[PDB]
Write an enzyme that holds these catalytic residues in place. Structure first.
Site, PDB file in Angstrom:
ATOM      1  N   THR A 266      -4.249  44.507  42.669  1.00  0.00           N
ATOM      2  CA  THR A 266      -4.215  44.186  41.743  1.00  0.00           C
ATOM      3  C   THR A 266      -4.231  44.775  39.911  1.00  0.00           C
ATOM      4  O   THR A 266      -3.376  44.296  39.341  1.00  0.00           O
ATOM      5  CB  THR A 266      -6.893  43.317  41.751  1.00  0.00           C
ATOM      6  N   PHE A 391     -13.542  41.785  37.606  1.00  0.00           N
ATOM      7  CA  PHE A 391     -14.790  41.742  39.257  1.00  0.00           C
ATOM      8  C   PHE A 391     -15.221  41.165  40.097  1.00  0.00           C
ATOM      9  O   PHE A 391     -16.435  42.178  41.416  1.00  0.00           O
ATOM     10  CB  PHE A 391     -14.869  43.251  38.524  1.00  0.00           C
ATOM     11  N   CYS A 398     -16.553  44.143  42.756  1.00  0.00           N
ATOM     12  CA  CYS A 398     -15.236  45.538  42.902  1.00  0.00           C
ATOM     13  C   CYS A 398     -16.193  45.987  42.506  1.00  0.00           C
ATOM     14  O   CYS A 398     -16.647  46.898  41.394  1.00  0.00           O
ATOM     15  CB  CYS A 398     -13.673  45.522  41.876  1.00  0.00           C
TER      16      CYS A 398
HETATM   17  C1  HEM Z   1      -7.081  45.182  38.274  1.00  0.00           C
HETATM   18  C2  HEM Z   1      -7.678  45.656  39.686  1.00  0.00           C
HETATM   19  C3  HEM Z   1      -8.745  44.557  40.354  1.00  0.00           C
HETATM   20  C4  HEM Z   1      -9.189  44.043  40.229  1.00  0.00           C
HETATM   21  C5  HEM Z   1      -9.569  42.305  38.898  1.00  0.00           C
HETATM   22  C6  HEM Z   1      -9.910  43.950  41.705  1.00  0.00           C
HETATM   23  C7  HEM Z   1     -10.787  42.847  41.967  1.00  0.00           C
HETATM   24  C8  HEM Z   1     -12.350  42.267  42.607  1.00  0.00           C
HETATM   25  C9  HEM Z   1     -12.529  41.749  43.150  1.00  0.00           C
HETATM   26  C10 HEM Z   1     -12.446  40.000  42.093  1.00  0.00           C
HETATM   27  C11 HEM Z   1     -13.204  41.452  44.864  1.00  0.00           C
HETATM   28  C12 HEM Z   1     -14.956  40.743  44.962  1.00  0.00           C
HETATM   29  C13 HEM Z   1     -14.158  40.280  46.160  1.00  0.00           C
HETATM   30  C14 HEM Z   1     -14.923  38.696  46.750  1.00  0.00           C
HETATM   31  O1  HEM Z   1     -16.000  38.577  45.941  1.00  0.00           O
HETATM   32  O2  HEM Z   1     -14.518  37.825  47.570  1.00  0.00           O
HETATM   33  C15 HEM Z   1     -13.103  42.548  44.572  1.00  0.00           C
HETATM   34  C16 HEM Z   1     -13.611  43.618  45.104  1.00  0.00           C
HETATM   35  C17 HEM Z   1     -13.586  44.951  45.794  1.00  0.00           C
HETATM   36  N1  HEM Z   1     -12.034  45.761  45.190  1.00  0.00           N
HETATM   37 FE1  HEM Z   1     -11.596  45.234  43.196  1.00  0.00          FE
HETATM   38  N2  HEM Z   1     -10.450  44.846  41.758  1.00  0.00           N
HETATM   39  C18 HEM Z   1      -9.364  45.779  41.583  1.00  0.00           C
HETATM   40  C19 HEM Z   1      -8.978  47.023  41.269  1.00  0.00           C
HETATM   41  C20 HEM Z   1     -10.293  47.422  43.170  1.00  0.00           C
HETATM   42  C21 HEM Z   1      -9.302  48.950  43.045  1.00  0.00           C
HETATM   43  C22 HEM Z   1      -8.373  49.901  42.236  1.00  0.00           C
HETATM   44  C23 HEM Z   1      -9.694  50.032  44.260  1.00  0.00           C
HETATM   45  C24 HEM Z   1      -9.950  50.900  45.198  1.00  0.00           C
HETATM   46  C25 HEM Z   1     -10.333  51.643  44.826  1.00  0.00           C
HETATM   47  C26 HEM Z   1     -11.224  48.182  43.958  1.00  0.00           C
HETATM   48  C27 HEM Z   1     -11.914  47.747  45.352  1.00  0.00           C
HETATM   49  C28 HEM Z   1     -12.306  46.829  45.990  1.00  0.00           C
HETATM   50  C29 HEM Z   1     -13.592  46.647  47.163  1.00  0.00           C
HETATM   51  C30 HEM Z   1     -13.260  48.129  47.706  1.00  0.00           C
HETATM   52  C31 HEM Z   1     -14.101  45.457  47.062  1.00  0.00           C
HETATM   53  C32 HEM Z   1     -15.375  45.078  47.676  1.00  0.00           C
HETATM   54  C33 HEM Z   1     -16.688  45.544  47.466  1.00  0.00           C
HETATM   55  C34 HEM Z   1     -17.222  44.429  48.404  1.00  0.00           C
HETATM   56  O3  HEM Z   1     -17.814  43.982  48.499  1.00  0.00           O
HETATM   57  O4  HEM Z   1     -18.869  46.244  48.863  1.00  0.00           O
HETATM   58  N3  HEM Z   1     -10.576  47.216  43.774  1.00  0.00           N
HETATM   59  N4  HEM Z   1     -12.254  43.251  43.641  1.00  0.00           N
END
Ligand code: HEM
Ligand SMILES: O=C(CCCCC1CCCCC1)N[C@@H](Cc1c[nH]c2ccccc12)C(=O)O
Length: 453
Positions: A266, A391, A398
């Site tokens: 992403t 996010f 996120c």
């Molecule tokens: C532009 C960059 C990013 C976007 C747009 C993004 C977007 C999101 C979104 C929308 C979710 C929620 C998913 C859901 O509700 O089903 C999420 C969860 C998550 N993201 Fe990201 N993300 C990004 C970058 C990252 C990065 C760099 C990492 C790790 C180094 C990461 C790790 C996670 C994790 C572990 C979750 C799950 C959190 C949880 O439910 O405990 N993401 N992200």
């Protein structure tokens, strides 16, 4: 009253509408036709797609709705298991890992990753500095080299060495294939049909490749002389304050895979869309470049300097507004509830949040929603609650938001300091969908301003 619903195909109902390589963009078009909510049915299955801030603010009430695993994530779960991204909130390993890993994204943790982000960013700048006069940059391809290497190095002290490769790293090719296999499992009536035997072997093969690399990361750390203090250190050592327990081996493995995938894809999309919008809006590019030159006065950017790149941050948020690279998330009703005073829902009923549509809500953003204007984010506090959700939401938002944004601000800042960019092909935006979104075939030329590193 019947809730709006797109065209049906007899007993298949709406399912054939997702028989397309661009399902999110198809759903956005449907949302434009039908408005803030529509029903989407398949045999044995129903969800409701939300597009307005009016309805999504209710959906983001954590007392009423919890994160649901969409069908795509349920198939991602076959290799991401009970990692953070594909776990249910009520699974013990969600809250443990959440508590254990949040300190890896603390202020002091981010300052700690800075130097290694710079390592990979310098590699990117040098690649481009070293191109011959004729040559061009393959944008999403190089952004993926950067973001994968950055998460590899910052999180696991492992060097993918993507800038030493013509092809993508085998992890990427397996990941892309596994995620496409998940997007295409959605369509298949009779999953156990012998016709899909080879896809299951191919799926087990791609998972094997990702898991093989996780072993390599684990063994590298196990026989390491150096004492790291990174994401893996926390997975291996850290204890949850609530239970008092650390993560077990099976879950650590899932977290590594999860972070490698969620931790780069992403973010590469974001950088690609941001550069795309900059080259299509030269006054905005000029403003961003002026900031980069004013702020990045040293050959290596400092943590503090990245934080001062206000306009670059605004550029990134506006790119996220238009093309949020994880474009949807799913919710279920915790109890019987009424959505919007109009749409009654029973316990367990599902919702999809169509983020790109939320981000085009004219009652929130005004009439010019298709225009790239970073100035919308002059004061981010002006944006109403639940209006800008790239996010996700609440405790299931996120975890890596601040990591993604620091990396993207650093890299884009360096890019704008070191190069002038030419949209030499007058690129026509073509958005490839693999669950996530990317501008496929996006290419530019970069003329070095000739400043030393
Ligand atoms: C532009 C960059 C990013 C976007 C747009 C993004 C977007 C999101 C979104 C929308 C979710 C929620 C998913 C859901 O509700 O089903 C999420 C969860 C998550 N993201 Fe990201 N993300 C990004 C970058 C990252 C990065 C760099 C990492 C790790 C180094 C990461 C790790 C996670 C994790 C572990 C979750 C799950 C959190 C949880 O439910 O405990 N993401 N992200
Ligand atoms: O919304 C979809 C299709 C687009 C996938 C969006 C990605 C989801 C993961 C995060 C990144 C974006 N699919 C939903 C809903 C759905 C509606 N009818 C269906 C029939 C069969 C399977 C799924 C489905 C989903 O995956 O559940």
């Amino acid at each position: 009253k019947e809730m709006p619903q797109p065209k049906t195909f007899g007993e298949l109902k709406n399912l054939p509408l997702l028989n397309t390589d661009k399902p999110v963009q198809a759903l956005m078009k449907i949302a434009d036709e039908l408005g803030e909510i529509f029903k989407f049915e398949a045999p044995g299955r129903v969800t409701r797609y939300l597009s307005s801030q009016r309805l999504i603010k209710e959906a983001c009430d954590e007392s009423r709705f919890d994160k649901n695993l969409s069908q795509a994530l349920k198939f991602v779960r076959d290799f991401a298991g009970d990692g953070l991204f594909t776990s249910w909130t009520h699974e013990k390993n969600w809250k443990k890992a959440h508590n254990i890993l949040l300190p890896s994204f603390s202020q002091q943790a981010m300052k700690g990753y800075h130097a290694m982000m710079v390592d990979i960013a310098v590699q990117l700048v040098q690649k481009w500095e070293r191109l011959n006069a004729d040559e061009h940059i393959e944008v999403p391809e190089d952004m993926t080299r950067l973001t994968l290497d950055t998460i590899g190095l910052c999180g696991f002290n492992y060097r993918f060495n993507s800038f030493y490769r013509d092809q993508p790293h085998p992890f990427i090719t397996s990941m892309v294939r596994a995620l496409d296999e998940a997007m295409n499992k959605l369509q298949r009536a009779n999953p156990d049909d012998p016709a899909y035997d080879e896809n299951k072997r191919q799926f087990q093969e791609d998972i094997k490749v990702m898991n093989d690399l996780v072993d390599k990361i684990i063994a590298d750390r196990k026989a390491s002389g150096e004492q790291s203090d990174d994401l893996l250190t926390h997975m291996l050592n850290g204890k949850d304050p609530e239970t008092g327990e650390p993560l077990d081996d099976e879950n650590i493995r899932y977290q590594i895979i999860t972070f490698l995938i969620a931790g780069h894809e992403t973010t590469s999309g974001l950088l690609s869309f941001a550069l795309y919008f900059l080259v299509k809006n030269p006054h905005v590019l000029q403003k961003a470049a002026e900031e980069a030159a004013r702020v990045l006065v040293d050959p290596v950017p400092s943590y503090k300097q990245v934080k001062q790149l206000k306009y670059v941050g605004m550029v990134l948020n506006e790119a996220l507004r238009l093309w949020p690279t994880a474009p949807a998330f799913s919710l279920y009703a915790k109890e019987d509830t009424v959505l919007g005073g109009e749409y009654p829902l029973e316990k367990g009923d599902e919702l999809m949040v169509l983020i790109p549509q939320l981000h085009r809500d004219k009652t929130i953003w005004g009439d010019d929603v298709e225009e790239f204007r970073p100035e919308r984010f002059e004061n981010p506090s002006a944006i109403p609650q639940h209006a800008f959700k790239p996010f996700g939401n609440g405790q299931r938002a996120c975890i890596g938001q601040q990591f993604a944004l620091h990396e993207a601000t650093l890299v884009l800042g360096m890019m704008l300091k070191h190069f002038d960019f030419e949209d030499h092909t007058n690129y026509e935006l073509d958005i490839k969908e693999t669950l996530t979104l990317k501008p496929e075939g996006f290419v530019v030329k970069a003329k070095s301003k000739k400043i030393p590193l």
